Homo-oligomer: A and B are copies of this chain.
Amino acid sequence: MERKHHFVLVHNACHGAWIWYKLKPLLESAGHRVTAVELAASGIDPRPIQAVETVDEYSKPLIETLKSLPENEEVILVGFSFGGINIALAADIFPAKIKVLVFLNAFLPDTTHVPSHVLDKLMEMFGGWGDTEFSSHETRNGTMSLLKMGPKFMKARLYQNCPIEDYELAKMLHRQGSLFTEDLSKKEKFSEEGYGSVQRVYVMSSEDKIIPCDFIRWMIDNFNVSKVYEIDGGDHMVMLSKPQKLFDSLSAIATDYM
């Protein structure tokens, strides 16, 4: 009996813990423990995104999850898409609780530029927003940029390799959210002693039509990882299009940090 791990899963913006519904039982059937976090104003969280003005407030459920682990427990901390920013923020707080960070089709921030850097780059490059709806909301500390995916955009750019039932599920659960670009432009840089110090790996899907493979090299060039894993045939929503293969990669990761 090889030693099992505690995986903490962190969803993407505009989604919630539900995205993990296929992966969670897989990992649990192998003996691992799983905590799928629901971030603020996400999923069935009762707050609107407008009430959650900062990335720290957005991430607080994940900080609380880690704070509540018993003394000396460490987890494998998986961040998906914007979830990469969330787990970098957590790692800067609780580095000794994290065995390894798994950046899954994720923004991988560095300790040199402002925290928004990798998001601002993608936003300059990306062309295919489609029917996504962009809006603002003024807060007492400045404009907060909001977004709500449109269904055609979802289909073409996030869910194109998923079963149709998954796409219908997503249409009934996705919500307006934010990438907190303003807030993250004003935040202190991520630290070397906290986030920098934690082991990290990247897991990319070969057919991610939102986080392209050149943009990943660019992020990794800019901030190195231990190892890159590739999921052959995954769309951006890889826990839905290729859950078994994702399990396989996570299981490999767990073996390299036994």
Closest B residue to A164 by beta carbon equals B25
Per-residue interface assignment for chain A, residues 33 to 51, with 1 indicating a CB less than 8 Å from any chain B CB and 0 otherwise = 0001010000110101000
Binding site for B on A (CB under 8 A): 16-18, 20-22, 24-25, 36, 38, 43-44, 46, 48, 164-166, 168-169, 172-173, 175
Which of A17, A38, A173 has the largest count of B CB atoms less than 10 A from its CB? A173
Say whether A172 contacts B38, CB under 8 Å.
yes
Nearest CB of chain B from residue A28's CB, rounded to whole Å: 8
Say whether B165 contacts A44, CB under 8 Å.
no
Q: Which 3 A-B pairs have the closest CB atoms?
A: A21-B169, A18-B172, A17-B172
Closest B residue to A25 by beta carbon equals B164
Residues of B with C-beta under 8 A to A43: 44, 172-173
Which of B46, B164, B172 is in CB contact (< 8 Å) with A48?
B46
Residues of B with C-beta under 8 A to A17: 172
List 12 contacting pairs A-B, 8 Å CB cutoff, sorted by A. Answer: A16-B172, A17-B172, A18-B173, A20-B168, A21-B168, A24-B168, A25-B164, A36-B172, A43-B44, A43-B173, A44-B175, A173-B173
Residues of B with C-beta under 8 A to A169: 18, 21, 169
Residues of B with C-beta under 8 A to A36: 172
Residues of B with C-beta under 8 A to A166: 21
Say whether A44 contacts B168, CB under 8 Å.
no
Residues of B with C-beta under 8 A to A172: 16-18, 20-21, 36, 38, 43-44
Nearest CB of chain B from residue A78's CB, rounded to whole Å: 16
Residues of B with C-beta under 8 A to A165: 21-22, 25
Say whether B44 contacts A44, CB under 8 Å.
yes
- Cα(A21)–Cα(B38), bound, Å: 21
